[PDB]
């Protein structure tokens, strides 16, 4: 498939908090550091 434009965001987080990177999730990270839109499209790649 072809995409109109591509945005890449990179950071480093805690192991337990990796589940907070998802639309509709709540917590410290999902609220005060990084919020994803509910109708989000795209991928998340997280590795130790």
């Amino acid at each position: 498939l072809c995409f109109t434009n591509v945005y890449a965001d990179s950071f480093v987080i805690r192991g337990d908090e990796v589940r907070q990177i998802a639309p509709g999730q709540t917590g410290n990270i999902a609220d005060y550091n990084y919020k994803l839109p509910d109708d989000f499209t795209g991928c998340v790649i997280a590795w130790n």
Binding site: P23, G24, Q25, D38
Partner: protein, 49 residues
């Protein structure tokens, strides 16, 4: 009528659950209510005839 969903209270569905399956529940509610209204309209049309 819950229409097979977990609850019949729409704002409860919003508040108590995250969007992923809350969307499914709301879609089920909307489909059920729309079907009921359609059935009522058709029955009214027959009576009008």
């Amino acid at each position: 009528s819950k229409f097979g969903a977990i609850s019949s209270v729409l704002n409860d569905i919003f508040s108590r659950l995250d969007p992923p399956e809350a969307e499914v529940q709301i879609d089920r509610l909307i489909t059920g209510r729309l079907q009921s209204l359609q059935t009522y309209v058709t029955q009214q049309l027959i009576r009008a005839a």
